[PDB]
């Protein structure tokens, strides 16, 4: 949560990084990671979704936000009302002048009884659509490996809404709704995996092995580069004659 509304020109991921909330899997994890990194910001704007007839702000034992249970801060775990889970049919127009990135998900319970307990319907259904695109996810009820005390999962999906387009969320169960949207941007932002420390110094080029000078035209440090880096080459050395015979 310390990274809320953060912005970067280079997000550096550490090999020691770990997840400590509800176990989740992102179908096409690479695509979401890459587009979020290219966006360069986690600027999140909450929106007034009117989830009628359901319990908002669900949580789990695995995801301890404070003294007790919690959940992802940018997701809303909808749960049955007293004894009903209506067919949510909410909508959100994009009257703004920029693309909106909505991150949502679908819950995968471990057992049929768990599914019926969280959601009155024996089988769930999530549909998230725009004027052109659409996605529908059918929850799968089955036991996964024990992770942080849970055999269930959450499958994370994303939708991008252009200006003038409108989002529609229609669900009958197993909806991990969004709390808003991430303001997308276009620019120089990217992401990198590196264990190297960060220091107060100047460098136009960055690599997982650390910053390197860019005076020379070629480099043999790493093929992963950011900035005005020299072109990667397999040769360890290349002596150019700055003199005569």
């Amino acid at each position: 949560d310390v990274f809320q509304n953060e912005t970067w020109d280079l997000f550096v991921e550490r090999s020691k990084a770990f997840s400590n909330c509800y176990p989740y899997d992102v179908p096409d994890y690479a695509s979401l990671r890459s587009l979020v990194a290219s966006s360069g910001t986690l600027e999140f704007i909450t929106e007034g979704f009117t989830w009628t007839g359901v319990t908002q702000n669900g949580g789990s034992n695995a995801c301890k936000r404070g003294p007790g249970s919690g959940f992802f801060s940018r997701l809303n775990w909808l749960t049955k009302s007293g004894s009903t889970y209506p067919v949510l049919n909410v909508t959100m127009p994009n009257n703004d002048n920029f693309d909106k990135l909505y991150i949502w998900g679908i819950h995968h319970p471990s057992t049929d009884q768990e599914q019926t307990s969280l959601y009155v319907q024996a089988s769930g259904r999530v549909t998230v659509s725009t004027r052109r695109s659409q996605q529908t996810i059918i929850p799968n009820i089955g036991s996964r490996p024990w992770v942080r005390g849970l055999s269930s999962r959450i499958s994370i999906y994303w939708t991008i809404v252009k200006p003038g387009d409108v989002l529609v969320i229609n669900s009958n169960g197993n909806l991990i709704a969004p709390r808003g949207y991430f303001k997308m941007r276009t620019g120089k932002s990217s992401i990198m995996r590196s264990d190297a420390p960060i220091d107060t110094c100047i460098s136009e080029c960055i690599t997982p092995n650390g910053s390197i000078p860019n005076d020379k035209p070629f480099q043999n440090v790493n093929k992963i580069t950011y900035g005005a880096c020299p072109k990667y080459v397999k040769q360890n050395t290349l002596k150019l004659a700055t003199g005569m015979r």
Partner: antibody
Amino acid sequence: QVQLQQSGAELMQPGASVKLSCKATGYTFAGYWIEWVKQRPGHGLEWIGEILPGIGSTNYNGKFKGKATFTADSSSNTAYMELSSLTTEDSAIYYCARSGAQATFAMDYWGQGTSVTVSG
Amino acid sequence: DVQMTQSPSYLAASPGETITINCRASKSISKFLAWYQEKPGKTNKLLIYSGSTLQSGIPSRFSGSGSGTDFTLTISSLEPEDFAMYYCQQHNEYPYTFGAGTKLELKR
């Protein structure tokens, strides 16, 4: 053969905290809601809250938001409720009850009721 | 928060007769009401759920009716064991609420 059996009676001083327990036998404890209800003379049954032990999803009544705190141990099929900062008004019987879609979330089985007496 | 009133708070009856017990909600709860029995010495028991569905194992002499804000439970041919305490509970709106309950006696 399905039942919920709770802890014995409790005698607490004001300002203390007590963890009532409820073991469940005869079914998959992780799948059904365990719902905690308060009863005392005149006021009658008063629903405290519920927990889905498998997920740990906890959900409280507003009047007991800070008073109660549910927990579950799936290995022993045991739910727990930690009543904190006890006062004389908390003296009451507390029931744990099984709930699920089988009975349309009406509590189809109940514990025997653990009594708590708060007094200095 | 759905408050309730279950009437009459006191019911006087004798074995063998048929009776009805009323429950009223502050606002609509559709069809979701349940009727429970409490007697000393053992666990509370679920009689009816969803207003009119009979719980398994319960004798058919218990039968519920109603909807919206008005509900009733008919207890027919009172056995001597049926003289216990009874509660009505909503499970439509989330904060489940119980009626104050009714006392059913015998040999009136």
